[PDB]
């Protein structure tokens, strides 16, 4: 300020409330511990496919955005739509989320910016840093070795994907949070026909819920096929 900002509300369906704990009990404890005030730390979250790495970054942003703290989320997979100069000034933010830092492997233009940003929030204080990736920071073949030892410097956690059991009640968790109701026969039907793709499962909920809203019928097994 000045000036103020637009109350742009994005999909807030990805919070700590809609995120199922198991088996990341130890990770979620330390994550909510560096989100304490005031606590400045660096946590690295690596996983494979659809473990919710971007979910926890969006959850940590909304956690501090709901109490007035300034936040920043940098999707390094969509880095073709912005520039490395967008990291400048983020050292004054309460939280900086670097998502998919393995996409800049070989991108010396971006590695230097990420490297400089780390040192800027290191010389200063009160700046939480959360970085996600595919593999541990040592398994990340970076061009600048000074950055690899810095992504190594901190607490590293391996995100665990939801089991097919917890996957069902995670879909049902988004139903009650959004307002609609997902019965257990429809949920165990989507896990079969959509082949357990969590990225598309919660994405398909909007398609199945909206078509059920504009009827307005309840979720039955053949109703999903009619929506399809």
């Amino acid at each position: 300020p000045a000036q103020l900002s637009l109350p742009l509300y994005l999909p807030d369906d990805e919070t700590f409330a809609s995120f199922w704990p198991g088996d990341n009990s130890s990770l979620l404890a330390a994550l909510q511990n560096v989100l304490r005030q005031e606590h400045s730390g660096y946590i690295y979250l690596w996983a494979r496919e659809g473990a919710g790495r971007s979910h926890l970054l969006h959850a940590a942003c909304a956690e501090l955005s709901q109490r007035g703290d300034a936040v920043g989320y940098v999707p390094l997979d969509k880095r073709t739509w912005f520039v490395p100069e967008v990291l400048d000034g983020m050292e004054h933010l309460s939280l900086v989320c670097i998502d998919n830092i393995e996409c800049i492997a070989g991108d010396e233009l971006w590695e230097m910016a990420i490297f400089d940003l780390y040192n800027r929030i290191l010389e200063s204080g009160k700046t939480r840093l959360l970085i996600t990736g595919d593999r541990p920071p040592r398994q990340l073949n970076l061009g600048l070795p000074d950055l690899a030892s810095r992504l190594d410097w901190g607490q590293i956690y391996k995100l665990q994907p939801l089991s097919d059991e917890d996957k069902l009640q995670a879909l049902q968790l988004r139903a009650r949070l959004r307002g609609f109701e997902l019965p257990e026969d429809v949920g165990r039907f989507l896990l079969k026909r959509l082949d357990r793709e969590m990225r598309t499962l919660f994405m398909t909920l909007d398609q199945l819920d909206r078509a059920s809203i504009t009827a307005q019928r309840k979720l039955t097994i053949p109703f999903v096929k009619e929506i399809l």
Partner: protein
């Protein structure tokens, strides 16, 4: 193989200009993909993010083939040639030869197999609307897009089809613009984010006519057909914010004023405003608006104008550039301002038609 074609200069200028525009950043990205297929000539140009294809009918003898050629150089050659001249183009070695009369040009080329071809996807929503409607949807919201933001979903314009109308939304976190125009056919509910440069290229391809615009919105790409030009662009893989959640819910203050007199009043007050922050303060009272501004040089400017307003008195600050952009997009008679309090968004729209709405966040 051996590519060779002969075509009049007047058949190339407009296709060349449409496929050779302001677009650094990679050797072959500055080249045009020429390819002769009996009996048409295709000119393609891309930038790894969007492509532009033009087809030219060849009525003169030709031979199939393909190659690439520097766009700006090849365009300036065909544009520099006299009016009505025939252009003979053929490949001789690793370079392309252009002949027109006693003029001979040799242009260094790159292999056509190295040209980035956009993977043809499955189209979904498809409709046809006039160019004037598409130009109105773009112009009314284009200026509110963000440029190179971490919010990559804001660096573009939201195309949203809902039943009978096509609606475009754009916001940058400080001000929002939303326009909506009806078409003649029923469309399935679908919304995509067209990139900034895609919006720029989508509007500059619109001419006088009289041809309609065939638009093919897909899962992750958008394609627009107009004339013999086929513009294709990738979509921004992101979630665009809800603009209906942004519109000021239940405002209690409504102000009508002449669009011109209001625009000129803000323009005069912006003269003595801050050069960097552009801060002006609006004081609404009984049938009166008072716009004031001042700069670090302690120079103050006061603009009072008669308006139609009956709500409670309020003083609210604004970025004069944001307000002037809205009044410039509203090429209308009178405007309507809907306010709540000094620290909340204000909706500006035309007092006649409500096809386009604008939201601007104030300053402290």
């Amino acid at each position: 193989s051996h590519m060779k074609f002969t075509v009049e200069r007047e058949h190339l200028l407009k296709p060349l200009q449409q496929v050779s525009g302001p677009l650094p950043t990679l050797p072959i990205l500055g080249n045009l993909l020429l390819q002769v297929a009996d009996g048409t000539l295709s000119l393609t140009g891309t930038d790894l993010e969007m492509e532009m294809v033009a087809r030219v009918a060849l009525v003169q003898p030709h031979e199939p083939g393909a190659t690439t050629v520097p766009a700006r150089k090849f365009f300036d050659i065909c544009r520099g040639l006299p009016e009505g001249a025939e252009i003979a183009v053929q490949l001789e070695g690793e370079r392309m030869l252009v002949r027109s009369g006693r003029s001979r040009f040799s242009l260094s080329t790159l292999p056509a197999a190295d040209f980035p071809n956009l993977d043809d996807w499955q189209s979904e929503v498809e409709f046809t609307l006039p160019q004037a409607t598409m130009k109105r949807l773009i112009e009314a919201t284009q200026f509110s897009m963000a440029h190179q933001d971490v919010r990559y979903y804001l660096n573009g314009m939201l195309f949203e089809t809902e039943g009978e109308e096509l609606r475009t939304v754009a916001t940058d976190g400080h001000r929002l613009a939303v326009c909506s125009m009806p078409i003649g056919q029923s469309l399935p509910s679908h919304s995509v984010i067209v990139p900034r440069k895609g919006v720029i290229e989508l509007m500059r391809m619109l001419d006088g006519g009289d041809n309609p615009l065939r638009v093919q919105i897909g899962s992750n790409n958008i394609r627009a057909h107009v004339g013999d030009f086929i513009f294709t662009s990738k979509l921004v893989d992101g979630r665009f914010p809800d603009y209906r959640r942004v519109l000021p819910k239940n405002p209690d203050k409504h102000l009508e004023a002449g669009c011109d007199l209001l625009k000129q009043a803000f323009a005069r007050a912006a003269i003595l405003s801050n050069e960097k922050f552009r801060g002006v303060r609006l004081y609404v009272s009984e049938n009166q608006l008072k716009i004031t501004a001042n700069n670090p040089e302690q120079e103050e400017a006061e603009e009072i104008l008669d308006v139609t307003y009956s709500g409670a008195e309020m003083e609210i600050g604004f970025n004069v550039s944001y307000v002037l952009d809205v009044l410039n997009a509203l090429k209308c008679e009178n405007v309507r301002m809907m306010l709540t309090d000094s620290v909340s968004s204000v909706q500006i729209e035309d007092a006649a038609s409500q096809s386009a709405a604008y939201v601007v966040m104030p300053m402290r």
